[PDB]
Structure formats: C-alpha cells, structure tokens
Write an enzyme that holds these catalytic residues in place. Structure first.
Site, PDB file in Angstrom:
ATOM      1  N   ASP A 122      47.555  65.300  57.501  1.00 56.92           N
ATOM      2  CA  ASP A 122      47.248  64.893  58.859  1.00 56.92           C
ATOM      3  C   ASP A 122      48.582  64.505  59.443  1.00 56.92           C
ATOM      4  O   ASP A 122      49.475  64.093  58.718  1.00 56.92           O
ATOM      5  CB  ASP A 122      46.272  63.715  58.899  1.00 56.92           C
ATOM      6  N   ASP A 124      49.280  62.016  61.250  1.00 54.75           N
ATOM      7  CA  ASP A 124      49.468  60.585  61.292  1.00 54.75           C
ATOM      8  C   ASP A 124      49.471  59.811  59.968  1.00 54.75           C
ATOM      9  O   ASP A 124      49.021  58.668  59.958  1.00 54.75           O
ATOM     10  CB  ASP A 124      48.412  59.971  62.238  1.00 54.75           C
ATOM     11  N   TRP A 184      32.322  67.444  63.028  1.00 49.31           N
ATOM     12  CA  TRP A 184      31.119  66.699  62.730  1.00 49.31           C
ATOM     13  C   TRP A 184      31.217  65.702  61.589  1.00 49.31           C
ATOM     14  O   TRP A 184      30.341  64.841  61.445  1.00 49.31           O
ATOM     15  CB  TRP A 184      29.986  67.677  62.480  1.00 49.31           C
ATOM     16  N   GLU A 187      34.207  67.593  56.139  1.00 51.67           N
ATOM     17  CA  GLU A 187      34.876  68.744  55.567  1.00 51.67           C
ATOM     18  C   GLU A 187      35.609  68.397  54.293  1.00 51.67           C
ATOM     19  O   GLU A 187      35.687  69.209  53.364  1.00 51.67           O
ATOM     20  CB  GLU A 187      35.833  69.394  56.586  1.00 51.67           C
ATOM     21  N   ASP A 188      36.141  67.181  54.247  1.00 52.27           N
ATOM     22  CA  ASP A 188      36.899  66.754  53.088  1.00 52.27           C
ATOM     23  C   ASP A 188      35.977  66.589  51.850  1.00 52.27           C
ATOM     24  O   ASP A 188      36.353  66.893  50.724  1.00 52.27           O
ATOM     25  CB  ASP A 188      37.767  65.496  53.465  1.00 52.27           C
ATOM     26  N   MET A 214      49.445  54.683  58.081  1.00 55.32           N
ATOM     27  CA  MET A 214      48.871  55.492  59.106  1.00 55.32           C
ATOM     28  C   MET A 214      49.743  55.187  60.323  1.00 55.32           C
ATOM     29  O   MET A 214      50.177  54.049  60.495  1.00 55.32           O
ATOM     30  CB  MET A 214      47.450  55.044  59.352  1.00 55.32           C
ATOM     31  N   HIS A 217      49.543  52.766  66.561  1.00 61.29           N
ATOM     32  CA  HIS A 217      50.177  52.298  67.795  1.00 61.29           C
ATOM     33  C   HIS A 217      50.426  50.786  67.666  1.00 61.29           C
ATOM     34  O   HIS A 217      49.576  50.045  67.136  1.00 61.29           O
ATOM     35  CB  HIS A 217      49.297  52.651  69.034  1.00 61.29           C
ATOM     36  N   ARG A 219      51.155  47.121  66.693  1.00 61.21           N
ATOM     37  CA  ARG A 219      50.699  46.512  65.448  1.00 61.21           C
ATOM     38  C   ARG A 219      49.201  46.164  65.387  1.00 61.21           C
ATOM     39  O   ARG A 219      48.716  45.298  66.134  1.00 61.21           O
ATOM     40  CB  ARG A 219      51.588  45.283  65.140  1.00 61.21           C
TER      41      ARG A 219
END
EC number: 2.4.1.-
Length: 272
Positions: A122, A124, A184, A187-188, A214, A217, A219
């Site tokens: 991902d 992030d 939805w 998937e993982d 992760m 934004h 803190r």
C-alpha cells in the site's frame, strides 16, 4: 562479480519514521543518485538473486507516494535488491479495486524485466527496520506484521494485508489475486485462503523487526478499529481458478517513466 551476501552489510536496523517534514521529490532524486529512470536500481558491488518488482495500487495519494519514495529507495538499496517501483494508478472514480491493480502490476512489470519476486505494497505503509527485507521467501511473505495504526500487533494470525511478497511462482500458483472484490472488503483474506488451498503458508519477520508506520496526517495516536476476517472461504474455493490472472482484463491508458518510479494509468472497469 560476486553474489550478494546472505544479509546485506549496509543494514542499519531500527529507523526513525515520521511525517512532520513535508518532502520534495527533487530532493529524493538527488539523495538517491544511483536510481535509474523509472525507479530502477541494480547493485554495482555484487549480483542480487532477488529481482524484485514493487507494486503500489494507487489513486490520488500523491502526497503519500512522496513519503513512500522518500523512505523506501534508500532502504531497498541497503537491502541490495535489483528492483523497480510500479505505481498502478486507477483512472476513473468508480470504487477502488486494490487486488485487480496489483494483478495489473504483476503483468506490466514483467514486460520491463525478468522479475522473479513481487512485493505488493500500500502506498501508505513504511517499514521501521531495514532487516524486514522487501524480498521473497520459501513461503508467501507478510511484511507489514506490526503496524503502529493497529497498536503494533497483528489483528489476527491470518491477516495478510498491507505489505506482502510472493515469488513469481507462488503468485502463478494461486492464479494471482481476485479481480472481483473491488472495494467491498476482504480481498486480502481471499488471497490468504488461496494460499491455504494451494498448500502454502505465511512467512513473517519477528514482530519487532516487522514494525511499520502508517502514513498518518499530522499526529494521530488513535489506534484504528480492529478489522475482523471476512468469512468467504467456501467462496474462494469455488472462484479461485476462474477469477484472477487468467480472467484479468484491462486497458493501459498511459505509461510514464518518472525519475523515481514507473506510473501506469489503467482503466480496469466498474463493478457489475
């Protein structure tokens, strides 16, 4: 030309990961001079056995990507990998389809080089310790094991989300990832179920080495809600062989080779 060592000698171990300091891509280019066009790097000092293609499913998260590129290019080189960055950008505005973009990435990346390893990440998530190698193992590998957003603890033993790596063979073996979950959820876990059925298991680094942040934004300590595994096990068993790499259809709209990554904008469809 000697083969690269077992573990790389350049490793630093724990690293400080924070996002107060906004970043500029120009600076990252200059800080990572050995990174050839399109986000490619191949060690000079030895031969890496890991030809890794890192695939990032993406759509309108330019800021995150900047922080991802900032932290991951240095790390990946210290790990001595022969690698390429691939940003699979979903053109469109229809619900997001993470698994399908990752499939698109697998296929597209093989057109550039004979990659034998794929890291699905991902945009992030940043690893906090360069000992958590971004490469393939004898069994499918779950890299983002302990994420700060989940209190540094795996949500459940069969969680396979965030960052994972599969060898080309491992990936072909499960017919790639499903193209039908869209956004939805699940998937993982379907992917985990595919692994179970083709008799593989999940490899993981220890929990301290597998720490990850992760890109949050400003803190926010606020540990996110715990995701609970979706029970679609009967469903994976019936659909695995028909939904995946062999049924993958898409149209590459545009391909840009930027200094630090390759950006493939694709049109993958809408839910039906």
């Amino acid at each position: 030309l000697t083969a690269c060592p077992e573990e790389s000698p350049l490793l630093v171990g724990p690293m400080l990961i924070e996002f107060n300091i906004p970043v500029d891509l120009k600076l990252i280019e200059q800080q990572n001079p050995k990174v050839k066009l399109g986000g490619r790097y191949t060690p000079m000092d030895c031969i890496s056995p890991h030809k890794v293609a890192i695939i990032i499913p993406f759509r309108n998260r330019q800021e995150h990507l900047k922080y991802w590129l900032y932290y991951l290019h240095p790390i990946l080189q210290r790990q001595q990998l022969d690698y390429g960055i691939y940003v699979i950008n979903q053109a469109g505005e229809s619900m997001f389809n993470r698994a399908k973009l990752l499939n698109v990435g697998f296929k597209e990346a093989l057109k550039d080089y004979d990659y034998n390893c794929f890291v699905f990440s991902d945009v992030d998530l940043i690893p906090m310790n360069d000992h958590n190698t971004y490469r393939c193992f004898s069994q499918p590998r779950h890299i983002s094991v302990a994420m700060d957003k989940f209190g540094f603890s795996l949500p459940y033993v069969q969680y396979f989300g965030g960052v994972s790596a599969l060898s080309k063979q491992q990936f072909l073996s499960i017919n790639g990832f499903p193209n039908n979950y869209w956004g939805w959820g699940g998937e993982d876990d379907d992917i985990y179920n595919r692994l179970a059925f083709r008799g593989m298991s999940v490899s993981r680094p220890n929990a301290v080495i597998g720490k990850c942040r992760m890109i949050r934004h400003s803190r926010d300590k606020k540990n996110e809600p715990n995701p609970q595994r979706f029970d679609r096990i009967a469903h994976t068993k019936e659909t695995m062989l028909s939904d995946g790499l062999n049924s993958l259809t898409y149209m590459v709209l545009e391909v840009q080779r930027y200094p630090l990554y390759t950006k493939i904008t694709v049109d993958i469809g809408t839910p039906s």
